[PDB]
Amino acid sequence: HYSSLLAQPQINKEIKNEDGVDIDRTLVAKQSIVKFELKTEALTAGRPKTTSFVLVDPLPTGYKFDLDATKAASTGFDTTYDEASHTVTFKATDETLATYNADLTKPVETLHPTVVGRVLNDGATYTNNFTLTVNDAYGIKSNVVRVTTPGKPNDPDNPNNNYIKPTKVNKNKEGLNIDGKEVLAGSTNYYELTWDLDQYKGDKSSKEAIQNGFYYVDDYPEEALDVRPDLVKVADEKGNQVSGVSVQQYDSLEAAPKKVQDLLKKANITVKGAFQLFSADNPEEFYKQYVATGTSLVITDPMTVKSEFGKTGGKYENKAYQIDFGNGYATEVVVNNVPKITPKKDVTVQLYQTFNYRLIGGLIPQNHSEELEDYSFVDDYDQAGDQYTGNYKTFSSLNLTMKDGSVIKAGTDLTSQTTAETDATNGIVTVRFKEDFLQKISLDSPFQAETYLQMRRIAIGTFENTYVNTVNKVAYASA
């Protein structure tokens, strides 16, 4: 008699987001409001009078139960919550018990409560069921329902699920990862920021979670580098361009719109000084086209070494963040070092005696980022006192390896790979390494060279002589 008390499907647990969309066995963003709806079908006619009508729902871990939201959605019940066992119980009021017992010869439609909370963890599966016991004589156990948040691989319901890991790598223009490498003055860091969106494929988040926006933050070292605002570009993982991503630079977080600071503090992101904020313009179109389709974006964010910072040297760090649906995830930190270049000069007298200016070049340290395209010696002598004979010899100052594999020994004459020229107007000798020899050198080998400029005194007295070394068209004085 009691197995036919509730009607056709009897009971049915449903799980929805805040737009009322069935999200069972699908994927939803972290912090999403998730409604457990404990539907119960009409009571058959010819029943006994209903003493009790009790639904008990043990809630899953990671689901933060909201008491006043679930009470408002469960009129006709009285809501009790056991915090120690994550269990919520709904007991039908005597007023809807009365409407269940108004005429037992007709079917009556029964009320149902709704649990309202939000999921709190990434890469978690949330399971739920509930039991309904009536008149402590029957009792029915419901079907299990599932929702999953992105962040865990090998999810059987979503085969694209994985770790939400935004990545940042430093590249030159050839695409070589230069993480941790040395970077010479005037060079540019072609930073690659990945906007990790693969795992969000199949997401059914609400329309207001999407309205929290989609952003990318880059905490760039403002004290060492300058942004190249016209070379920032957002592309998908293949190469096609992305228009719908705007970029704004802020010199400090405290000098930024209060919306932006609220954004970062609700994602637990804090920035050292200046940062960039990539925005989605219209988040809804950005969602349908990149988030819901699981197509990650790539942001090339090139920045160049300041002039002064190349002369002082030091180290700098870049770090980025990804902010989807309001939730923040952080890249690892990429580190680079700028070497301080300081060439020196000695001499090696008496009227018309020949002598050499020894011009030692700057040390290009091991494990550098960019190809050498310029290593030149520039000597501005006093033509009224000394004159340049026209002979000179350039030697490596250390052991040079390169791409073929050979190692050029320390002290080897490299003058058959140089090119001099003379400016008689100002009195300037310029010994240059050509490009095709410099661009034959491995990026992991060091580089240093010296030239001996043969000169002779043609006047009495002492005379000043300035020497300037050049590496990739940045000029270093000397002492």
**Which residues are annotated binding-site positions?**
163, 196, 198-199, 219-220, 222, 272, 274, 380-381, 383, 426-427
Q: Which is nearer to Ca ion, 175 or 273 (CB)?
A: 273
Nearest distance, CB of residue 221 and Ca ion, angstroms: 6
C-alpha to C-alpha distance for 390 and 242, rounded to whole angstroms: 57
Tell me which of 147, 256, 274, 297 binds Ca ion, using CB under 5 A. 274
Q: Do residues 365 and 424 make contact, with C-beta atoms less than 8 angstroms apart? A: no
C-alpha to C-alpha distance for 313 and 231, rounded to whole angstroms: 25
C-alpha to C-alpha distance for 120 and 32, rounded to whole angstroms: 8
- Beta-bridged to residue 193, according to DSSP, are 168, 299
Nearest distance, CB of residue 329 and Ca ion, angstroms: 18
Piece of 106-114, 214-222, 238-246, 298-306 that binds Ca ion (CB under 5 A): 214-222
Other CB atoms within 10 Å distance of the CB of residue 250: 18
By CB under 5 A, is residue 427 in contact with Ca ion? yes
Piece of 144-152, 205-213, 269-277, 432-440 that binds Ca ion (CB under 5 A): 269-277
User: Residues followed by a break in the chain, C–N over 2.5 Å?
Assistant: 348
> Which secondary structure element, helix H or strand E, spans residue 346, and what is its range?
strand 344-347
Q: Which is nearer to Ca ion, 90 or 215 (CB)?
A: 215
Tell me which of 14, 219, 301, 450 binds Ca ion, using CB under 5 A. 219
By CB under 5 A, is residue 273 in contact with Ca ion? yes
- The residue type at 193: L
Largest CA distance in the chain: 132
- Reference 121, options 197, 60, 70; nearest CA is 60
Q: Which is nearer to Ca ion, 410 or 459 (CB)?
A: 459
Q: Which is nearer to Ca ion, 122 or 301 (CB)?
A: 301
- 290's tokens: 């990149």
Q: Which is nearer to Ca ion, 58 or 385 (CB)?
A: 385
By CB under 5 A, is residue 343 in contact with Ca ion? no
By CB under 5 A, is residue 159 in contact with Ca ion? no
Q: Which residue has its beta carbon closest to Ca ion?
A: 427
CA-CA distances (angstroms) from residue 443 to 187, 220, 372, 373, 450?
Answer: 14, 25, 8, 12, 20
Q: Which is nearer to Ca ion, 366 or 383 (CB)?
A: 383
C-alpha to C-alpha distance for 465 and 381, rounded to whole angstroms: 5
Dihedral angle of Cα 382, 385, 387, 393, to the nearest 10 degrees = -70
Using CB under 5 A as the criterion, what x/- string covers residues 362-391 for binding Ca ion? ---------------------x--------
C-alpha to C-alpha distance for 469 and 448, rounded to whole angstroms: 11
By CB under 5 A, is residue 269 in contact with Ca ion? no
Nearest distance, CB of residue 424 and Ca ion, angstroms: 9
CA-CA distances (angstroms) from residue 339 to 184, 316, 366, 368, 455?
Answer: 6, 12, 10, 9, 32
Nearest distance, CB of residue 391 and Ca ion, angstroms: 19
C-alpha to C-alpha distance for 197 and 280, rounded to whole angstroms: 14
Nearest distance, CB of residue 454 and Ca ion, angstroms: 17
CA-CA distances (angstroms) from residue 385 to 279, 347, 354, 378?
Answer: 64, 15, 13, 18
Annotated binding-site members for Ca(2+): 163, 196, 198-199, 219-220, 222, 272, 274, 380-381, 383, 426-427
DSSP state letter for 340 = P
Piece of 39-47, 207-215, 368-376, 423-431 that binds Ca ion (CB under 5 A): 423-431
Q: Which is nearer to Ca ion, 101 or 383 (CB)?
A: 383
Piece of 81-89, 110-118, 266-274, 385-393 that binds Ca ion (CB under 5 A): 266-274
Nearest distance, CB of residue 71 and Ca ion, angstroms: 46
Q: What burial letters (b/e) apply to 267-283, b meaning 16+ CB within 10 Å?
A: bebebeebbbbbbbeeb
Q: Which is nearer to Ca ion, 119 or 271 (CB)?
A: 271
Nearest distance, CB of residue 26 and Ca ion, angstroms: 39
Nearest distance, CB of residue 285 and Ca ion, angstroms: 30
C-alpha to C-alpha distance for 77 and 55, rounded to whole angstroms: 10
Q: Which is nearer to Ca ion, 263 or 449 (CB)?
A: 263
Who contacts 406 (Cβ-Cβ below 8 Å, separation ≥6)?
none
Within 89-148, the residues that bind Ca ion by CB under 5 A are none
Piece of 111-119, 215-223, 297-305, 310-318 that binds Ca ion (CB under 5 A): 215-223
Q: How many residues bind Ca ion (CB under 5 A)?
A: 7
By CB under 5 A, is residue 317 in contact with Ca ion? no
Q: Which is nearer to Ca ion, 320 or 438 (CB)?
A: 320
Backbone angles phi, psi at 311, to 5 degrees: -90, -30
Piece of 125-133, 136-144, 222-230, 441-449 that binds Ca ion (CB under 5 A): 222-230
By CB under 5 A, is residue 272 in contact with Ca ion? yes
Q: Which is nearer to Ca ion, 137 or 384 (CB)?
A: 384
Other CB atoms within 10 Å distance of the CB of residue 463: 12
CA-CA distances (angstroms) from residue 206 to 20, 69, 127, 413?
Answer: 9, 17, 20, 71
Q: Which residues bind Ca ion (CB under 5 A)?
A: 219, 222, 272-274, 383, 427
